[PDB]
GROMACS .gro file of C-alpha atoms in nm:
model
  365
    1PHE     CA    1  -1.177   1.256   1.496
    2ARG     CA    2  -1.282   0.895   1.547
    3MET     CA    3  -1.046   0.752   1.283
    4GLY     CA    4  -0.744   0.932   1.407
    5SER     CA    5  -0.583   0.656   1.618
    6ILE     CA    6  -0.644   0.414   1.327
    7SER     CA    7  -0.489   0.650   1.085
    8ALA     CA    8  -0.189   0.684   1.311
    9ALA     CA    9  -0.147   0.306   1.352
   10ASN     CA   10  -0.163   0.265   0.978
   11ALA     CA   11   0.102   0.531   0.924
   12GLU     CA   12   0.347   0.383   1.187
   13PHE     CA   13   0.291   0.043   1.034
   14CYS     CA   14   0.348   0.188   0.686
   15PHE     CA   15   0.700   0.315   0.787
   16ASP     CA   16   0.776  -0.018   0.968
   17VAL     CA   17   0.700  -0.200   0.651
   18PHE     CA   18   0.898   0.043   0.438
   19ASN     CA   19   1.202  -0.005   0.665
   20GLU     CA   20   1.194  -0.375   0.606
   21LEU     CA   21   1.078  -0.388   0.249
   22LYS     CA   22   1.351  -0.145   0.127
   23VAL     CA   23   1.624  -0.380   0.261
   24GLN     CA   24   1.536  -0.647   0.004
   25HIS     CA   25   1.411  -0.421  -0.278
   26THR     CA   26   1.715  -0.211  -0.332
   27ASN     CA   27   1.745  -0.010  -0.661
   28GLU     CA   28   1.390  -0.092  -0.737
   29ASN     CA   29   1.048   0.080  -0.756
   30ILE     CA   30   0.840   0.012  -0.443
   31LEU     CA   31   0.462   0.025  -0.427
   32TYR     CA   32   0.233  -0.110  -0.148
   33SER     CA   33  -0.072  -0.026   0.045
   34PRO     CA   34  -0.016  -0.019   0.421
   35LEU     CA   35  -0.398   0.028   0.466
   36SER     CA   36  -0.499  -0.287   0.266
   37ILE     CA   37  -0.226  -0.497   0.440
   38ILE     CA   38  -0.318  -0.382   0.786
   39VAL     CA   39  -0.683  -0.455   0.716
   40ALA     CA   40  -0.595  -0.806   0.599
   41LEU     CA   41  -0.394  -0.869   0.920
   42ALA     CA   42  -0.669  -0.711   1.134
   43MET     CA   43  -0.907  -0.977   0.992
   44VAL     CA   44  -0.662  -1.261   1.094
   45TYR     CA   45  -0.594  -1.089   1.429
   46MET     CA   46  -0.964  -1.126   1.506
   47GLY     CA   47  -0.904  -1.507   1.524
   48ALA     CA   48  -0.552  -1.505   1.687
   49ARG     CA   49  -0.513  -1.594   2.050
   50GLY     CA   50  -0.218  -1.610   2.300
   51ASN     CA   51   0.130  -1.508   2.197
   52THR     CA   52   0.024  -1.493   1.831
   53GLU     CA   53  -0.240  -1.227   1.904
   54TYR     CA   54  -0.007  -1.046   2.135
   55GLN     CA   55   0.266  -1.022   1.861
   56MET     CA   56   0.010  -0.884   1.611
   57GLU     CA   57  -0.129  -0.636   1.864
   58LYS     CA   58   0.213  -0.485   1.899
   59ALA     CA   59   0.332  -0.499   1.534
   60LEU     CA   60   0.003  -0.342   1.405
   61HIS     CA   61   0.026  -0.072   1.667
   62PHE     CA   62  -0.317  -0.158   1.809
   63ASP     CA   63  -0.178  -0.150   2.159
   64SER     CA   64  -0.196   0.232   2.127
   65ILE     CA   65  -0.547   0.270   1.999
   66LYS     CA   66  -1.928  -1.011   2.013
   67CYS     CA   67  -1.636  -1.033   1.778
   68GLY     CA   68  -1.357  -1.003   2.035
   69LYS     CA   69  -1.197  -0.727   2.240
   70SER     CA   70  -1.101  -0.502   1.949
   71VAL     CA   71  -1.438  -0.492   1.772
   72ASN     CA   72  -1.418  -0.107   1.767
   73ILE     CA   73  -1.097  -0.129   1.554
   74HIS     CA   74  -1.267  -0.374   1.319
   75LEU     CA   75  -1.570  -0.146   1.292
   76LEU     CA   76  -1.352   0.161   1.215
   77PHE     CA   77  -1.152  -0.014   0.937
   78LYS     CA   78  -1.489  -0.129   0.783
   79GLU     CA   79  -1.614   0.223   0.778
   80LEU     CA   80  -1.286   0.360   0.634
   81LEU     CA   81  -1.264   0.106   0.355
   82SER     CA   82  -1.641   0.168   0.264
   83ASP     CA   83  -1.548   0.533   0.216
   84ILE     CA   84  -1.266   0.491  -0.019
   85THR     CA   85  -1.368   0.189  -0.208
   86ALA     CA   86  -1.606   0.290  -0.492
   87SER     CA   87  -1.630   0.357  -0.861
   88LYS     CA   88  -1.727   0.709  -0.931
   89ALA     CA   89  -1.660   0.875  -1.266
   90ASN     CA   90  -1.280   0.876  -1.312
   91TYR     CA   91  -1.218   0.701  -0.989
   92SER     CA   92  -1.179   0.330  -0.926
   93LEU     CA   93  -1.029   0.186  -0.605
   94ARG     CA   94  -1.071  -0.184  -0.540
   95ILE     CA   95  -0.934  -0.389  -0.246
   96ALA     CA   96  -0.923  -0.767  -0.284
   97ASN     CA   97  -0.876  -0.914   0.054
   98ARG     CA   98  -0.926  -1.286   0.136
   99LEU     CA   99  -0.808  -1.558   0.368
  100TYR     CA  100  -0.818  -1.893   0.192
  101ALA     CA  101  -0.848  -2.183   0.425
  102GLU     CA  102  -0.801  -2.560   0.379
  103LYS     CA  103  -1.119  -2.768   0.383
  104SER     CA  104  -1.005  -2.992   0.661
  105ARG     CA  105  -0.946  -2.686   0.893
  106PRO     CA  106  -1.313  -2.625   0.967
  107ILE     CA  107  -1.389  -2.265   1.047
  108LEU     CA  108  -1.557  -2.173   1.375
  109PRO     CA  109  -1.911  -2.045   1.313
  110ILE     CA  110  -1.838  -1.737   1.520
  111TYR     CA  111  -1.528  -1.644   1.319
  112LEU     CA  112  -1.732  -1.696   0.992
  113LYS     CA  113  -2.004  -1.471   1.125
  114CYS     CA  114  -1.753  -1.209   1.237
  115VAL     CA  115  -1.587  -1.200   0.893
  116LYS     CA  116  -1.931  -1.168   0.722
  117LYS     CA  117  -2.018  -0.872   0.953
  118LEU     CA  118  -1.690  -0.698   0.952
  119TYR     CA  119  -1.476  -0.809   0.655
  120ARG     CA  120  -1.703  -0.857   0.350
  121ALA     CA  121  -1.656  -1.178   0.160
  122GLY     CA  122  -1.307  -1.205   0.316
  123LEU     CA  123  -1.290  -1.587   0.385
  124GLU     CA  124  -1.306  -1.887   0.143
  125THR     CA  125  -1.257  -2.253   0.222
  126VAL     CA  126  -1.083  -2.450  -0.060
  127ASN     CA  127  -0.937  -2.795  -0.102
  128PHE     CA  128  -0.571  -2.738  -0.069
  129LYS     CA  129  -0.503  -3.104   0.047
  130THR     CA  130  -0.583  -3.265  -0.279
  131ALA     CA  131  -0.641  -2.980  -0.519
  132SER     CA  132  -0.374  -2.720  -0.417
  133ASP     CA  133  -0.301  -2.645  -0.781
  134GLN     CA  134  -0.656  -2.572  -0.888
  135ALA     CA  135  -0.697  -2.378  -0.570
  136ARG     CA  136  -0.395  -2.171  -0.673
  137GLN     CA  137  -0.524  -2.100  -1.023
  138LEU     CA  138  -0.867  -2.002  -0.869
  139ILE     CA  139  -0.702  -1.762  -0.621
  140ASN     CA  140  -0.490  -1.604  -0.893
  141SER     CA  141  -0.783  -1.562  -1.135
  142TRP     CA  142  -0.978  -1.386  -0.867
  143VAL     CA  143  -0.695  -1.155  -0.794
  144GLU     CA  144  -0.644  -1.093  -1.174
  145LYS     CA  145  -1.007  -1.016  -1.223
  146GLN     CA  146  -1.044  -0.783  -0.922
  147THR     CA  147  -0.739  -0.591  -1.029
  148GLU     CA  148  -0.861  -0.535  -1.397
  149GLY     CA  149  -0.604  -0.775  -1.535
  150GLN     CA  150  -0.299  -0.598  -1.365
  151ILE     CA  151  -0.189  -0.837  -1.083
  152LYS     CA  152  -0.129  -1.178  -1.247
  153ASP     CA  153   0.019  -1.493  -1.090
  154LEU     CA  154   0.017  -1.337  -0.738
  155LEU     CA  155   0.064  -1.686  -0.583
  156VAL     CA  156   0.341  -1.837  -0.769
  157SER     CA  157   0.381  -2.211  -0.846
  158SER     CA  158   0.617  -2.306  -0.573
  159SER     CA  159   0.396  -2.137  -0.305
  160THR     CA  160   0.101  -2.392  -0.241
  161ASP     CA  161   0.099  -2.762  -0.186
  162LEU     CA  162  -0.106  -3.035  -0.013
  163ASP     CA  163   0.012  -2.905   0.324
  164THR     CA  164  -0.102  -2.546   0.280
  165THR     CA  165  -0.360  -2.458   0.545
  166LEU     CA  166  -0.411  -2.077   0.525
  167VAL     CA  167  -0.316  -1.821   0.261
  168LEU     CA  168  -0.364  -1.447   0.317
  169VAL     CA  169  -0.417  -1.272  -0.029
  170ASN     CA  170  -0.434  -0.901  -0.059
  171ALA     CA  171  -0.441  -0.688  -0.363
  172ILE     CA  172  -0.516  -0.326  -0.424
  173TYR     CA  173  -0.607  -0.153  -0.766
  174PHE     CA  174  -0.635   0.221  -0.814
  175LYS     CA  175  -0.691   0.411  -1.134
  176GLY     CA  176  -0.768   0.783  -1.096
  177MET     CA  177  -0.734   1.097  -1.303
  178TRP     CA  178  -0.523   1.415  -1.238
  179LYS     CA  179  -0.739   1.702  -1.141
  180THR     CA  180  -0.502   1.966  -1.306
  181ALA     CA  181  -0.525   1.770  -1.632
  182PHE     CA  182  -0.173   1.719  -1.782
  183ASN     CA  183  -0.216   1.796  -2.157
  184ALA     CA  184  -0.072   1.500  -2.354
  185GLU     CA  185   0.048   1.733  -2.622
  186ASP     CA  186   0.308   1.844  -2.363
  187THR     CA  187   0.405   1.487  -2.248
  188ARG     CA  188   0.733   1.399  -2.405
  189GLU     CA  189   1.043   1.167  -2.353
  190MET     CA  190   1.300   1.322  -2.107
  191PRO     CA  191   1.596   1.165  -1.931
  192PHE     CA  192   1.530   1.029  -1.585
  193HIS     CA  193   1.852   1.044  -1.388
  194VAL     CA  194   1.844   0.725  -1.178
  195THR     CA  195   2.198   0.808  -1.060
  196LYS     CA  196   2.452   1.088  -1.164
  197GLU     CA  197   2.597   0.818  -1.409
  198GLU     CA  198   2.274   0.629  -1.521
  199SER     CA  199   1.978   0.790  -1.697
  200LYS     CA  200   1.687   0.610  -1.862
  201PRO     CA  201   1.419   0.767  -2.092
  202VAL     CA  202   1.077   0.821  -1.937
  203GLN     CA  203   0.747   0.973  -2.069
  204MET     CA  204   0.741   1.296  -1.858
  205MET     CA  205   0.418   1.491  -1.805
  206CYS     CA  206   0.446   1.864  -1.769
  207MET     CA  207   0.194   2.084  -1.570
  208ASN     CA  208   0.198   2.462  -1.497
  209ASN     CA  209  -0.067   2.559  -1.237
  210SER     CA  210  -0.135   2.648  -0.882
  211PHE     CA  211  -0.039   2.368  -0.633
  212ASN     CA  212   0.027   2.333  -0.256
  213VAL     CA  213   0.401   2.276  -0.219
  214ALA     CA  214   0.638   2.265   0.081
  215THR     CA  215   0.979   2.406   0.005
  216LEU     CA  216   1.215   2.261   0.261
  217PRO     CA  217   1.578   2.355   0.208
  218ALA     CA  218   1.687   2.240   0.563
  219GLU     CA  219   1.577   1.884   0.452
  220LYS     CA  220   1.699   1.954   0.086
  221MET     CA  221   1.359   1.860  -0.053
  222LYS     CA  222   1.029   1.972  -0.197
  223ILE     CA  223   0.690   1.818  -0.129
  224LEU     CA  224   0.415   1.865  -0.391
  225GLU     CA  225   0.048   1.794  -0.329
  226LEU     CA  226  -0.140   1.687  -0.643
  227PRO     CA  227  -0.524   1.648  -0.621
  228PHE     CA  228  -0.710   1.405  -0.832
  229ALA     CA  229  -1.002   1.492  -1.052
  230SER     CA  230  -1.264   1.296  -0.840
  231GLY     CA  231  -1.260   1.112  -0.495
  232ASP     CA  232  -1.115   1.209  -0.172
  233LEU     CA  233  -0.763   1.089  -0.245
  234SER     CA  234  -0.453   1.300  -0.332
  235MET     CA  235  -0.087   1.239  -0.398
  236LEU     CA  236   0.211   1.377  -0.222
  237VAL     CA  237   0.554   1.362  -0.402
  238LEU     CA  238   0.860   1.394  -0.188
  239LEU     CA  239   1.138   1.514  -0.436
  240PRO     CA  240   1.494   1.538  -0.307
  241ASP     CA  241   1.669   1.845  -0.420
  242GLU     CA  242   1.982   1.647  -0.517
  243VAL     CA  243   1.995   1.378  -0.779
  244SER     CA  244   2.090   1.122  -0.520
  245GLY     CA  245   1.921   1.278  -0.218
  246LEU     CA  246   1.676   0.994  -0.183
  247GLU     CA  247   1.888   0.773   0.053
  248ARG     CA  248   1.923   1.044   0.334
  249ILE     CA  249   1.548   1.103   0.320
  250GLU     CA  250   1.468   0.731   0.333
  251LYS     CA  251   1.704   0.688   0.624
  252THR     CA  252   1.522   0.960   0.820
  253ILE     CA  253   1.162   0.943   0.712
  254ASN     CA  254   0.898   0.819   0.957
  255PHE     CA  255   0.544   0.918   1.071
  256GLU     CA  256   0.669   1.192   1.303
  257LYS     CA  257   0.903   1.333   1.040
  258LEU     CA  258   0.646   1.314   0.758
  259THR     CA  259   0.401   1.507   0.975
  260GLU     CA  260   0.668   1.780   1.049
  261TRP     CA  261   0.754   1.818   0.677
  262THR     CA  262   0.379   1.841   0.573
  263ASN     CA  263   0.277   2.075   0.848
  264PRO     CA  264   0.025   2.329   0.720
  265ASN     CA  265   0.257   2.611   0.818
  266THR     CA  266   0.508   2.548   0.534
  267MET     CA  267   0.265   2.411   0.276
  268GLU     CA  268   0.207   2.705   0.041
  269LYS     CA  269  -0.022   2.765  -0.255
  270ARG     CA  270   0.185   2.883  -0.549
  271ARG     CA  271   0.248   2.845  -0.920
  272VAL     CA  272   0.459   2.534  -0.991
  273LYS     CA  273   0.600   2.405  -1.322
  274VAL     CA  274   0.573   2.032  -1.250
  275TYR     CA  275   0.753   1.750  -1.432
  276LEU     CA  276   0.633   1.410  -1.332
  277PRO     CA  277   0.673   1.058  -1.500
  278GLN     CA  278   0.368   0.885  -1.606
  279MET     CA  279   0.239   0.724  -1.276
  280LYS     CA  280   0.139   0.368  -1.370
  281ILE     CA  281   0.320   0.111  -1.138
  282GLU     CA  282   0.271  -0.246  -1.035
  283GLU     CA  283   0.453  -0.444  -0.755
  284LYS     CA  284   0.397  -0.782  -0.597
  285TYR     CA  285   0.530  -0.903  -0.266
  286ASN     CA  286   0.558  -1.215  -0.056
  287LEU     CA  287   0.531  -1.035   0.281
  288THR     CA  288   0.605  -1.336   0.501
  289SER     CA  289   0.960  -1.263   0.592
  290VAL     CA  290   0.885  -0.895   0.632
  291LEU     CA  291   0.592  -0.959   0.874
  292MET     CA  292   0.796  -1.206   1.077
  293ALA     CA  293   1.090  -0.971   1.103
  294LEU     CA  294   0.837  -0.706   1.227
  295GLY     CA  295   0.764  -0.930   1.518
  296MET     CA  296   0.464  -1.153   1.393
  297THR     CA  297   0.686  -1.470   1.380
  298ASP     CA  298   0.422  -1.704   1.540
  299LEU     CA  299   0.163  -1.650   1.270
  300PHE     CA  300   0.385  -1.811   1.009
  301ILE     CA  301   0.506  -2.122   1.204
  302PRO     CA  302   0.329  -2.439   1.331
  303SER     CA  303   0.298  -2.305   1.679
  304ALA     CA  304   0.064  -2.019   1.553
  305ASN     CA  305  -0.240  -1.982   1.783
  306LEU     CA  306  -0.528  -1.920   1.546
  307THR     CA  307  -0.793  -2.101   1.768
  308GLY     CA  308  -1.030  -1.825   1.713
  309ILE     CA  309  -1.040  -1.923   1.342
  310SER     CA  310  -1.040  -2.306   1.379
  311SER     CA  311  -1.004  -2.573   1.629
  312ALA     CA  312  -0.804  -2.781   1.387
  313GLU     CA  313  -0.479  -2.923   1.522
  314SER     CA  314  -0.233  -2.764   1.295
  315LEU     CA  315  -0.287  -2.418   1.146
  316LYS     CA  316  -0.072  -2.129   1.037
  317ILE     CA  317  -0.042  -1.868   0.759
  318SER     CA  318   0.147  -2.042   0.488
  319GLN     CA  319   0.195  -1.729   0.272
  320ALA     CA  320   0.090  -1.363   0.289
  321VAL     CA  321   0.105  -1.203  -0.056
  322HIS     CA  322   0.036  -0.849  -0.157
  323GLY     CA  323  -0.009  -0.697  -0.508
  324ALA     CA  324  -0.040  -0.331  -0.572
  325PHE     CA  325  -0.128  -0.145  -0.884
  326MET     CA  326  -0.156   0.246  -0.914
  327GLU     CA  327  -0.235   0.449  -1.224
  328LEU     CA  328  -0.317   0.814  -1.280
  329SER     CA  329  -0.446   0.896  -1.624
  330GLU     CA  330  -0.463   1.241  -1.791
  331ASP     CA  331  -0.750   1.442  -1.952
  332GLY     CA  332  -0.756   1.516  -2.318
  333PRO     CA  333   0.405   3.455  -1.414
  334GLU     CA  334   0.716   3.290  -1.262
  335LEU     CA  335   0.678   2.927  -1.148
  336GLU     CA  336   0.859   2.728  -0.886
  337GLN     CA  337   1.033   2.433  -1.045
  338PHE     CA  338   0.944   2.075  -0.940
  339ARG     CA  339   1.121   1.856  -1.183
  340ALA     CA  340   1.081   1.491  -1.076
  341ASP     CA  341   1.356   1.352  -1.295
  342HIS     CA  342   1.542   1.163  -1.031
  343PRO     CA  343   1.437   0.927  -0.764
  344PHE     CA  344   1.162   1.025  -0.532
  345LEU     CA  345   0.912   0.901  -0.276
  346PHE     CA  346   0.535   0.940  -0.311
  347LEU     CA  347   0.218   0.840  -0.135
  348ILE     CA  348  -0.150   0.846  -0.194
  349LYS     CA  349  -0.356   0.975   0.098
  350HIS     CA  350  -0.724   0.981   0.203
  351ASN     CA  351  -0.760   1.354   0.265
  352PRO     CA  352  -1.055   1.336   0.524
  353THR     CA  353  -0.867   1.097   0.756
  354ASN     CA  354  -0.487   1.156   0.650
  355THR     CA  355  -0.479   0.772   0.604
  356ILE     CA  356  -0.183   0.648   0.379
  357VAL     CA  357  -0.348   0.450   0.110
  358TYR     CA  358  -0.035   0.385  -0.098
  359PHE     CA  359   0.330   0.430  -0.030
  360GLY     CA  360   0.604   0.413  -0.281
  361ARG     CA  361   0.946   0.478  -0.425
  362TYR     CA  362   0.996   0.583  -0.799
  363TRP     CA  363   1.350   0.465  -0.864
  364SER     CA  364   1.353   0.404  -1.242
  365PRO     CA  365   1.127   0.381  -1.533
   0.00000   0.00000   0.00000
């Protein structure tokens, strides 16, 4: 299992991000890709030195797993992304990952070559100094095109100016299809109980088929596995038994607990009557504060050491922005109930590696 340590680092980072993200996104849907974020940061890490590099190594959990000392890590991420990025029939996963760099911060040839070999077309030089607004529009157009129109204005107007030197831009798009097709003649409006007092209407899909499901009364939850019609991704839905059971589960979830709850011992194939809201979600984040709070403070202040990217005097990450879009479309004996009509957590995983590709909270339609 070559990819096992990288999958584990990604999961630990996922829950580190969730713990920070949820502090400032209360009573809100959450959707992000720990994988696309960690790949973006690994690309920057390749050019970081000194304390900046050390902080990233710890915060990305690389301290537990040519182009620098961590070339193997870069090689494993490149291989993993190549697996999951693809357009098959009924499967489209796109990651848009780019570091935009000010013209007057010349890029070291070695970093440019390393990005070409390991991180695709992941680096672009632009004129922020005297064309920061055109640069902004060009960046946002690229993100918008790569996400099939779904992630618009990722870099907002206040975010770039003549002093911008580096912007990390990361977006992920996924559109897949349910394997057990939900028949649209059964989709209908049902109340979603955001709280015991507040309900909102949602288009609710209904399925009745064999599914793997963990039934966990000691944790007061059920975990449903939903395969997709094509690709090697699947969804897990963690549904609290109680209308307001989410908070207790968010306070306790981490990589170790998630592994315990999904152990194959208690995952059982059985007939399930599933109610699930239409899963089409978009979220955008400025992750600068979150990543500083995780320990990568140096990267975002003028004392950043990015001398493996450029020898220029001043250099730092001005903004790190992430946009995530996820959609699953449909196709044209007693049952266990799985009625996801109150807030829940969900994730999309890459089955061959157990890598978390998306992590999210469904709070409200």
